[PDB]
């Protein structure tokens, strides 16, 4: 639409919200493959921040490029490293969600604020395979990665 389309060039960082994502219960409904920043640069954020960010987007883009396909052709017909990215991306998708302080009347969850290093670390860890044992839902609607671990214990019994 001319209005938002013409607005993009005026910004240094863009957060793009999506109804498809919100429809899933993922809030904030940020499209991680359509949000950009001028400072997303290894010489500015350091190569660690950068490499994890690009890693997160790659696994989400790869999972997206498999979605419509396996959705009709079967999950079992996949490579043992494909279904590992599919499980990791599904967990990263969820770890991107977060209970907002402002959103307590919508979520029923206490709001969480996650410091930068903890965000980097958490996603860095899921990418390296460190939580393949943990179920998907443990990562849904939490703050830091330790809460994904705590929730995994609570879901067991």
């Amino acid at each position: 639409d001319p209005a938002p389309a013409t607005t993009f060039a005026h910004l240094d960082a863009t957060t793009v919200l999506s109804r498809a994502i919100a429809e899933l219960g993922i809030y904030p409904a940020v499209d991680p493959l359509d949000s950009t920043s001028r400072i997303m640069d290894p010489n500015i954020v350091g190569s660690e921040h950068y490499d994890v960010a690009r890693g997160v987007q790659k696994i989400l883009q790869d999972y997206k490029s498999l979605q419509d396909i396996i959705a009709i052709l079967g999950m079992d017909e996949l490579s043992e490293e494909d279904k590992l990215t599919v499980s990791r991306a599904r967990k990263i998708q969820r770890f991107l969600s977060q209970p907002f302080q402002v959103a307590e009347v919508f979520t029923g969850h206490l709001g969480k604020l996650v410091p930068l290093k903890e965000t980097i670390k958490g996603f860095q860890q899921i990418l390296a395979g460190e939580y393949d044992h943990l179920p998907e839902q443990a990562f849904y609607m939490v703050g830091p990665i330790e809460e994904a671990v705590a929730k995994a214990d609570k879901l067991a019994e």
Binding site: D68, I69, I72, L73, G74, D76, E77
Partner: protein, 167 residues
């Protein structure tokens, strides 16, 4: 309905067409080996699998029905590699059709050699049909897309014309 919806649906079914055509090819090479491997193991015979997407292979034996093939327990590692002597069944007729201590192992091997010959034909056929259906759905959605393309352009122009004319 929207160009955005058609573009997405077209993106998905174009892929599905390429996958099912490549799977037809995988199942075609596996069939030809299992077809020439059948003949010596047939006259010898007088004395399903894990993998789905192969028509009514798995369902047909289950309707008739400890089981061989992991699709039997759910309704391991069999079907993947051509059955050896070391490793209710589907008797191979043609590419298009099939029908559902030592003397025991003779029957096990014969039914197994028959099963994957019937499976790789049926998966080759199923994948052939899925690829052809996808191909039609593509041509149909392309025509829809271009009708919608033309209407959007024309609609948008008429809105402009009507605004200008009313000045």
């Amino acid at each position: 309905a929207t160009l955005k919806d058609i573009t997405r649906r077209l993106k998905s079914i174009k892929n599905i067409q390429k996958i099912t055509k490549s799977m037809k090819m995988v199942a075609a090479a596996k069939y030809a080996r299992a077809e020439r491997e059948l003949k010596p193991a047939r006259v010898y015979g007088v004395g399903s699998s894990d993998r789905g997407l192969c028509g009514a292979i798995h369902s047909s034996v289950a309707k008739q029905m400890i089981g061989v093939g992991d699709k039997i327990r759910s309704i391991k590692e069999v079907g993947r590699r051509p059955p050896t002597f070391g490793d209710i069944f589907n008797r191979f007729r043609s590419v298009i059709s099939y029908k559902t201590e030592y003397s025991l192992a003779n029957i096990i091997y014969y039914s197994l050699k028959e099963s994957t010959t019937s499976e790789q034909s049926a998966r080759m056929t199923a994948m052939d049909n899925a690829s052809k259906n996808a191909s039609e759905m593509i041509d149909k959605l392309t025509l829809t897309f271009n009708r919608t393309r033309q209407a959007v352009i024309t609609k948008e122009l008429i809105e402009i014309i009507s605004g200008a004319a009313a000045l």
